Amino acid sequence: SDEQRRELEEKIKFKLAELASKSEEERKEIKLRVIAYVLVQLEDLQKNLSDEQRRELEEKIKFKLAELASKSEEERKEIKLRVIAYVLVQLEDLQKNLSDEQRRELEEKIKFKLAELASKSEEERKEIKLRVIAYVLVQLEDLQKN
Ligand SMILES: [Cl-]
Ligand code: NA
């Protein structure tokens, strides 16, 4: 819906507003936490998905990454922030809708991905970030069909 689109835009920009007061060190940590969370959610979804469904989505990520290459650093920074805020919206929902147990394993699953991400080189680290941004833009584009 258009009225449904407008509500999600407000939420994204509202979430971004809480980011303005946080510090570059806090913001770096939030960015890294968001990435790790998208990664566990990615991994979990690849289990429950087909060999063909995994090819189709992998190419969806790549086509999205190609659109990003077409954009200016200003737009790319904007896009990066929208995705991060949109993920933070879900993390808010997630934080309310599950109890201390489900919260627990997720934190651990987050912690592993952060560990896995720290062990990577800088080129690969940058590559994972961008794929995570592209993937969220993918599912964001699917949801933005309703
Ligand atoms: Cl970026
Ligand atoms: Na690496």
Author numbering: 3 to 148
Paper text:
We extended previously described algorithms for tandem repeat protein design in order to construct deeply knotted backbones and matching designed repeat sequences (N = 3 repeats for the trefoil and N = 5 for the pentafoil). We developed an approach for designing tandem repeat proteins that fold into a class of knotted topologies known as torus knots.
While kcTRP3c.1 and 3c.2 remained recalcitrant to crystallization, crystals of kcTRP3d.1, 3d.2, and 3d.3 grew readily, and their structures were solved via molecular replacement. kcTRP3d.1 and 3d.3 were phased with the original designed atomic coordinates of kcTRP3d as a molecular probe. The crystal structures of kcTRP3d.1–3 validated the accuracies of the designed molecular models and their intended deeply knotted topologies. Superposition of the structures to the original designed atomic coordinates of kcTRP3d produced all-atom rmsd values of 1.84 Å (kcTRP3d.1), 1.43 Å (kcTRP3d.2), and 1.90 Å (kcTRP3d.3). Atomic force microscopy (AFM) based single-molecule force spectroscopy (SMFS) was performed on kcTRP3d.1 to assess its single-molecule unfolding behavior. The tensile strength of this construct is considerably higher than other known purely alpha-helical domains such as spectrin (around 40–50 pN). However, the measured unfolding force is weaker than other naturally occurring proteins such as muscle protein Titin IG27 (around 250 pN), as well as other de novo designed proteins such as Top7 (approximately 150 pN), or the ultrastable pulling handle ClfA (around 2400 pN)28 at similar force loading rates. As the tensile strength of other unknotted designed proteins is also high, it is thought likely that the high tensile strength of kcTRP3d.1 studied here is due to the optimization processes and not the knot.
